[PDB]
């Protein structure tokens, strides 16, 4: 008969959309997941899904940085407290090294 029934769910198609070095315009989704596999860094936002999106035009970069959580989020704090006195956690981040300058001064007129 088969006692087990139910798990016929498809794959979520999650993962990295933009790998390191890829040029990225503002608003594009860099990477999608459940549970922070990758974290947001410079010029990278977060949705409600934990999906990372780019906040500026330029090159995506991945980097191992030091994890220091917000003091109001409690679990992380607890974990930190638990750790021995020389250790630091480390975590993988996604930055967007911005390409163009925010703007340039151009000549309007000679008054």
């Amino acid at each position: 008969s088969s006692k087990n029934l139910g798990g016929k769910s498809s794959g979520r198609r999650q993962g990295i959309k933009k790998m390191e070095g890829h040029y990225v315009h503002a608003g594009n989704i860099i990477a999608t997941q459940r549970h922070f596999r990758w974290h947001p860094g410079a010029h990278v936002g977060v949705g409600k899904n934990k999906c990372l999106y780019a906040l500026e035009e330029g090159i995506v970069r991945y980097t191992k940085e030091v994890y220091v959580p917000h003091p109001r989020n409690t679990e992380a704090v607890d974990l930190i407290t638990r750790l021995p006195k020389g250790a630091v956690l480390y975590k993988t981040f996604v930055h967007v090294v911005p390409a163009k300058p925010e703007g340039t001064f151009k000549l309007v007129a000679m008054l």
Binding site: S1, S2, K3, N4
Partner: protein, 205 residues
């Protein structure tokens, strides 16, 4: 207590999750108990295979019968049976889910030492019944002292070194000389020529 203790069939706390039959616990050489631990003689398993409770019982009994308990002792080097095995009822059509659990079995790999022996004795005294045990067992097995084992290893090493055949298996594999990886397994880089399935060709190199 110098005597093989009772290895009861199944654990006392059984497991409701049915495992899939991964045969990779048979395939290849044993990562686990290759070397000794305070026992001069042993039964070396020269091949992979699952040990039923019956086999265990046999091992226990024969040794006990032909043991000199004051002068010698014995140890299990294999756990009690723990991998469950589902058999379906007699003569069912295919499908309708996975079958119910029947019996439990320890996987042994080649290179494992199954039973260990020690005490005031030579290997010549212990050979007789250990050989019998080996014969009884469900794989290539060999009654093996420490010294004997060492000798065997040395011989193997020599073979590896000596051979005038320029073409080893390893060389052909890793370099991918004939695109031969289209034939070979991905495990045939670590195992090399020596291991095929549960079988371990000890001569070849």
């Amino acid at each position: 207590k110098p005597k093989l203790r009772f290895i009861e069939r199944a654990p006392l706390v059984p497991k409701v999750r049915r495992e899939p039959k991964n045969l990779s616990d048979i395939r290849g050489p044993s990562t686990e108990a290759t070397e000794f631990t305070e026992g001069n003689f042993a039964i070396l398993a020269l091949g992979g295979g699952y040990l039923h409770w019956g086999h265990f019982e046999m091992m226990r009994l024969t040794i006990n019968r032909s043991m000199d308990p004051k002068n010698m002792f014995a140890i299990w080097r294999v756990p009690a049976p723990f991998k469950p095995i589902t058999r379906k009822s007699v003569g069912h059509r295919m499908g309708g889910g996975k079958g119910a659990i029947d019996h439990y079995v320890t996987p042994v790999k080649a290179g494992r030492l199954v039973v260990e022996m020690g005490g005031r004795c030579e290997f010549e005294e212990v050979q007789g019944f250990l050989d019998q045990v080996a014969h009884k067992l469900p794989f290539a097995a060999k009654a093996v002292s420490r010294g004997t084992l060492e000798k065997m290893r040395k011989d193997q090493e020599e073979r590896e070194r000596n051979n005038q055949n320029p073409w080893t298996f390893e060389r052909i594999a890793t370099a991918n000389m004939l695109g031969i990886r289209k034939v070979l397994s991905p495990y045939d880089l670590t195992h090399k020529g020596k291991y095929w399935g549960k079988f371990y060709m000890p001569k070849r190199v």
